[PDB]
């Protein structure tokens, strides 16, 4: 059973040059730290994720952590050999989940007694990395056997390897990217605009009881679809009995197709404990991302000393495979020890979260020695 | 030049079983109708398009019609031989454009003296087809040498071939589809939601100078990107000097990246003469679309007699090539004379609107086969 832990810092300076007071983030760990503290693997989480990479907090949890299939005794990320640790990001999307601890727009400003809202400082991938670094230092750790993560987690992983080259021995990027290129930065903006259009957003100053729930659900509808595939939607439609000439949307401009109703309800269910401002801040962190946060991707790649493994999903429509190919080729041309293998299932981006065990052997082989 | 024309129907029955009075749509044509009226090619337009497929209304128009590269004397669709005609759809997105004539939510209901708004009946691809059919009948035309269109225009073209099989000798579908599958219907819904979130939308009842402008702009940002590619956005970013760690969005949550400022400005420029409700109605027409408007695609393909040509774009992220492959394979399995060729350019969906001449010869030889 996993114990959720909390890490606190009285003062923190962001990459943008601003102060955050009384940082608190959640974390958890699996396995045993060895005497040299040389067996640490840091898992960095995806956009809508948390530190809960494996295991259960309680027996009656319906599901274990999202990467339970590859984290455990004898698994590809072997907790019999490694101390596997993971940390909630700042501005964590799941701001109202009782198992998540974060700091961000929903945090109470002492000088006002209300949430910071959009008074909270802009956060970056680097800020998540630096909070993780401070936690590791508080545990006496000064090196990582590996850093591993999917999607926004792959961004944290490769930034670790570039920003702190002597800290990171191995870097695994899953359904990932070396930067948010202009395409990706524009693509993520569409996740933000529905929240900004919701009449309850009030420029970020909303109360929890009058939240922009419709805009947040609209954002999650787009996120949910972007991270999947036509095959998934069409098979879902088959189960629903979807067809084009459905009587309700033909007769009423305000009624929707079966597949749209399904997606709206799925998004509303996903969004139950999420916060809209936190979504906006995570969008902005991703838009500012390049490995190493120097002038361009080439500079960031040139700093990486870790050997690297990239695992794009062939059918990913969100962080498309070319982003992984770009980083892998850049590293290969710099004589970095870099490998790329592919997830080939039909869940698109979500292959890297729900079906990462399809490349468990590539991960296991990469972590051997 | 080109003269914009208007077609009026006093009474019109929709596919959904409702009445529209005083239907007016714009149209135009190029070339000469022969004595047998046997040389008619109908062009059906894409989601944000109009009847203006070729030529200029005024010499000082900054650009000709969107398919001018393939419609004209000696071009792939040869107006020395064919009479090439095109019709504005109902609920045309470009509701305030000085040349477009349409009927939709912005129109004045003669019964109330006031705009329909969301009182306008739901429209379908079939309704666009039936307005075109009525215009053609008013001109004494009773058969189409071909019907040709990109994207939403491909939907009109293949519905023509399915619903009125004897009317259609040839059907060209560009960057197209035989149905809006579950994926596509969900994808199009995201074009609608920003409008309905904007408080100014007022459940459809907004006035022209109090429109949901920022919701419409957000919709057009998503439409613009969905129809392009990473290559296009990244090349655009390079021209803008896009950088990852731009100082403005790092320092201020309310500032944006260069590429976002560019997209927002592009969207607002596109939307200047558009209407938000019309966008909602066109989304719904596309979501209701299957060729023939029967219960599935196979039933619609079964009635097609016309020979068919499909021209997907390899890099299309909006109507992906598998939609064209699905319709084409369904037709060849029924022993329809069907051909598929592919646009290979890097502009995605927009290949079919702005670069269709890359497959000009395939179109020409499909049409010129005596």
- Within 3-32 of B, beta carbons closer than 8 Å to A belong to 15-16
Q: Distance between CA atoms of A308 and A364, rounded to whole angstroms?
A: 13
CB contact under 8 A, A182 and B296: no
Distances (CA, A) of B61 to A188, B75, B92, B94, B169: 36, 21, 21, 17, 34
| Cβ–Cβ under 8 Å, residues A68 and A75 | no
Among A302, A319, A306, A312, which Cα is nearest to A366's? A306
Q: Which residue in B45, B278, B293, B349 is the catalytic one?
A: B349
Q: Name the residue with tokens 């890099």.
A: B315
Using CB atoms, which residue from A234, A288, A320 is nearest to B230?
A320
φ, ψ of residue A247 to 5 degrees: the values are -65, -40
Q: Chain A, 41-100: which have a CB under 8 Å from a chain B CB?
A: none
Q: Which residue has the tokens 């109703």?
A: A261
Q: Do A242 and B182 touch (CB under 8 A)?
A: yes
**Closest by CA position to A53, among listed A177, A226, A228, A172:** A172
* Whole-angstrom distance, CA of residue B24 vs CA of residue A241: 37
Residue B239 touches partner A, C-beta closer than 8 Å: no
Yes or no, beta carbons of B263 and A186 under 8 Å apart: yes
- The Cα of A62 is separated from the nearest Cα of chain B by a number of Å equal to 29
Distance from CA of A281 to the nearest CA of B (A): 8
Would you say B301 and B178 are in contact if contact means Cβ atoms under 8 Å apart? yes
The residue of chain B nearest to residue A218, with distances taken between CA atoms, is: B193
Nearest chain B residue to A125 by CA distance is B245
From residue B319, alpha-carbon distances to A168, A354, B98, B216 in Å are 43, 27, 30, 22
Chain A residues lying within 8 Å of B118, measured CB to CB: 253-254
- Whether A151 and A317 have beta carbons less than 8 Å apart is answered as no
CA dihedral A328, A330, A335, A340 (to 10 degrees): 10
Distance CA A226, CA B343 (A): 24
Q: What CA–CA distance (Å, rounded) separates B31 from B75?
A: 12
Q: Is B130 on the interface with A (CB under 8 A)?
A: no
Contact A59, A1 (CB under 8 A): yes
- Residue B329, Cβ neighbours under 10 Å: how many? 15
CB contact under 8 A, B253 and A225: no
Residues 6+ apart with CB under 8 A from A239: none
**The sheet that has A307-311: what strands, in order across it?**
A5-13, A19-30, A83-87, A40-43, A146-150, A170-174, A307-311, A338-340
Q: Does B189 contact A at CB distance below 8 Å?
A: yes
Cα–Cα distance for residue pair B365/B76, rounded to 1 Å: 8
**In A, residues 267-306, which contact B (CB 8 Å cutoff)?**
280-281, 284, 287-290, 293, 295-297
Contact B183 A233 (CB under 8 A): yes
Please tell me the distance in Å from A124's CA to the nearest CA on chain B.
8
* Among A316, A324, A328, A338, the one annotated catalytic: A316
Q: Which residue of A has its CA nearest to B15?
A: A250
User: For residue B360, what is the enclosing H or E element?
Assistant: helix B360-367
Give the experimental resolution in Å: 1.5
Question: What's the rounded Cα separation, in Å, for the pair A148 and A42?
Answer: 6
B211 touches chain A (CB under 8 A): no
Residue B305 CB burial class (10 angstroms; 0-12, 13-18, ≥19) = middle
Kindly determine whether residue A257 and residue B287, on different chains, have CB atoms separated by under 8 Å. Answer: yes
Element (H, E) at B20: strand B19-30
- CA separation for the pair B338, A10 (Å, rounded): 70
| A chain contacts of residue B194, beta-carbon cutoff 8 Å | 193-194, 197, 218
**Number of Cβ within a 10 Å radius of residue B9:** 18
- Chain A positions touching B346 (Cβ under 8 A) are none
Whether B349 is catalytic is yes
Give A243's contacts (C-beta < 8 A, 6+ positions apart): B290, B295, B296
What is the DSSP secondary-structure string of B174-221?
A: ES--SB--HHHHHHHHHHHHHHHHBGGGGGGT--GGG--HHHHHHHHH
Whether residue A213 lies within 8 A of chain B, CB to CB, comes out as: no
Number of residues assigned to chain A? 369
User: In degrees, to the nearest 5, what angle opens at C-alpha A154 toward C-alphas B263 and A168?
Assistant: 135
Smallest CA–CA distance, residue A297 to chain B, in Å, is 9
Instruction: Tell me if chain A has a CB within 8 Å of the CB of B190.
Output: yes
Instruction: Report yes or no: A244 at the B interface, CB cutoff 8 Å.
Output: yes
Query: B-chain residues within 8 Å CB-CB of A194?
Result: 193-194, 197, 218
Which residues on chain A are in Cβ contact (under 8 Å) with B229?
183
Nearest residue of A to residue B213, measured between CA atoms: A197
The full length of chain B comes to 370
The sign one gets for the Cα dihedral A330, B239, A288, A303 is: positive
Closest CA to B352 of B154, B146, B128, B155: B154
In angstroms, the separation between the Cα of residue B338 and the nearest Cα of chain A is 24
CA distance B353 to B364: 17
Residue recorded with tokens 């190029």: B30
- C-alpha A321/C-alpha A337 separation (Å) is 19
How many angstroms separate the CA atoms of A112 and A84, rounded?
39
Q: What is the rounded distance in angstroms from the CA atom of residue A284 to the CA atom of residue B254?
A: 10
Of A182, A183, A197, the CB nearest to B197: A197
Experimentally determined by: X-ray
> Would the CB atoms of B233 and A190 count as touching at under 8 Å?
no
Nearest alpha carbon to residue A31 among A53, A47, A10: A53
Taking an 8 Å cut-off on Cβ atoms, the answer to whether B293 and A245 are in contact is yes
Q: Please state whether beta strands B5-13 and B19-30 pair in parallel, antiparallel, or not at all (unpaired).
A: antiparallel
Instruction: Please give the Cα distance from A86 to A74 (Å, whole number).
Output: 19
Taking the CA of residue A354 and the nearest CA in chain B, the distance in Å comes to 20
- Report the alpha-carbon distance of residue A34 to residue A36 in Å, rounded: 6
CB atoms within 10 A of CB B359: 24
Asked if A199 has any chain B CB less than 8 Å from its own CB, the reply is yes
Interface touch B244/A198, C-beta < 8 Å: no
Q: Using CA coordinates, name the residue in chain A closest to B244.
A: A288
Q: In b/e form, how buried is each residue of A117-149, taking b as 16+ CB within 10 angstroms?
A: bbebbbbbbbbbbbbbbbbbeebebeebbbbbb
Rounded to the nearest angstrom, the minimum Cα separation between B363 and chain A is: 29
Rg for chain B (alpha carbons), in Å? 20
Q: Does A198 touch chain B (CB under 8 A)?
A: yes
SS3 category, B171: strand
Q: How many CB atoms lie within 10 A of CB A73?
A: 10
Judged by CB atoms closer than 8 Å, whether chains meet at A249 and B296 is answered as no
A vs B, Cβ pairs < 8 A, gives 183
| Number of domains within chain A | 1
β-sheet with B146-150: strand ranges across = B5-13, B19-30, B83-87, B40-43, B146-150, B170-174, B307-311, B338-340
DSSP conformational letter for B358: G
Residue A29 and residue A83 in contact, taking contact as beta carbons nearer than 8 Å:
yes
Task: Give the rounded distance of the alpha carbon of B331 from its chain centre.
Answer: 23
d(CA A14, CA A20): 7
Strands B77-78 vs A40-43: parallel, antiparallel or unpaired: unpaired
Query: B360-364 long-range contacts, Cβ below 8 Å, gap at least 24?
Result: B360/B69, B360/B70, B360/B75, B360/B76, B361/B76, B362/B309, B362/B311, B363/B70, B363/B76, B363/B77, B363/B148, B363/B172, B363/B309, B363/B311, B364/B75, B364/B76, B364/B77, B364/B78
**Contact call for B190 and A253, based on CB within 8 A:** no
Structural contact between residues B136 and B146, judged by C-beta atoms closer than 8 angstroms: no
What contacts A96, CB < 8 A, 6 or more positions away? A106, A208, A273, A274, A275
Return the closest-CA partner of residue A103 out of A134, A136, A129, A131: A131
Closest approach of chain B CAs to the CA of A356, in angstroms?
Answer: 24
Given a contact cutoff of 8 angstroms between Cβ atoms, the answer to whether B312 and B340 are in contact is: yes
Q: Are the beta carbons of B148 and B157 closer than 8 angstroms?
A: yes
**Which residues is A172 bridged to in the sheet?**
A148, A309
Integer angstrom CA distances of residue A91 from A48, A104, A282: 10, 4, 7
Cross-chain CB nearest to A16 (options B197, B238, B250): B250
Q: Inform me whether the C-beta atom of residue A248 falls under 8 Å from chain B C-beta atoms.
A: no
Reported for B265-272, long-range contacts at CB under 8 A and 24+ positions apart, including other chains, are: B266/B220, B266/B221, B266/B224, B267/B217, B267/B218, B267/B219, B267/B220, B267/B221, B267/B224, B268/B213, B268/B217, B268/B220, B270/B48, B270/B220, B270/B224, B271/B213, B271/B216, B271/B217, B271/B220, B272/B96
For the purposes of burial, counting CB atoms within 10 Å of the CB of B90, is it exposed (0-12), middle (13-18) or buried (19 or more)?
buried
Range of the domain at B181: 1-370
Angle at A28 between CA A22 and CA A30, to 5 degrees: 155
Which residue bears the tokens 């009624």? A255
Structure tokens at A350: 């979500």
Q: How many CA atoms lie within 13 A of B220 on its CB side?
A: 26
């Amino acid at each position: 059973m996993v114990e959720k832990r909390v890490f606190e810092m009285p003062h923190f300076t962001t990459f943008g040059g601003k102060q955050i007071k009384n940082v608190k983030v959640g974390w958890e760990a699996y396995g045993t730290l060895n005497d040299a503290k040389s067996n640490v693997i840091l898992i960095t989480h995806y956009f809508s994720g948390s530190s809960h990479a494996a295991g259960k907090y309680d027996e009656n949890d319906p599901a274990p952590g999202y990467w339970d299939s590859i984290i455990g005794p004898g698994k590809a990320i072997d907790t019999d050999r490694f101390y596997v640790i993971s940390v909630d990001t700042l501005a964590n999307l799941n701001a109202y989940d009782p198992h998540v601890i974060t700091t961000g727009p929903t945090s109470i400003n002492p000088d006002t007694g209300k949430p910071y809202g959009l008074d909270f400082p802009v956060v970056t991938i680097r800020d998540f990395v630096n909070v993780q670094k401070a936690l590791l230092e508080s545990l006496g750790i000064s090196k990582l056997y590996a850093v591993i993560g999917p999607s926004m987690g792959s961004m944290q992983a490769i930034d670790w390897a570039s920003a702190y080259p002597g800290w990171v021995e191995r870097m695994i990027s899953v359904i990932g990217a070396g930067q948010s290129d202009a395409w990706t930065t524009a693509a993520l903006e569409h996740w933000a605009t529905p929240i900004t259009l919701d009449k309850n957003w009030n420029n970020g100053a909303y109360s929890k009881e009058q939240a922009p729930l419709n805009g947040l659900a609209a954002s999650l509808m787009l996120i949910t679809q972007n991270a999947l595939t036509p095959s998934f939607f069409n098979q879902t439609g088959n189960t629903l009995g979807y067809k084009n000439v459905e009587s309700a949307p033909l007769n009423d401009i305000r009624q929707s197709h079966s597949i749209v109703n399904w997606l709206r309800e799925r998004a509303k269910t996903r969004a139950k404990s999420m916060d809209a401002n936190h979504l906006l801040y995570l969008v902005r962190a991703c838009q500012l991302f390049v490995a190493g946060h120097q002038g361009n991707l080439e500079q960031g790649l040139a700093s990486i000393k870790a050997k690297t493994l990239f695992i794009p999903a062939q059918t990913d429509l969100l962080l498309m495979p070319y982003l992984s190919q770009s980083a892998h080729q850049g590293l290969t041309s710099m004589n970095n020890d870099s490998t790329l293998v592919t997830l080939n299932g039909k869940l698109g981006h979500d292959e890297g979260v729900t079906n990462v065990s399809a490349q468990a052997q590539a991960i296991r082989q990469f972590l051997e020695n």
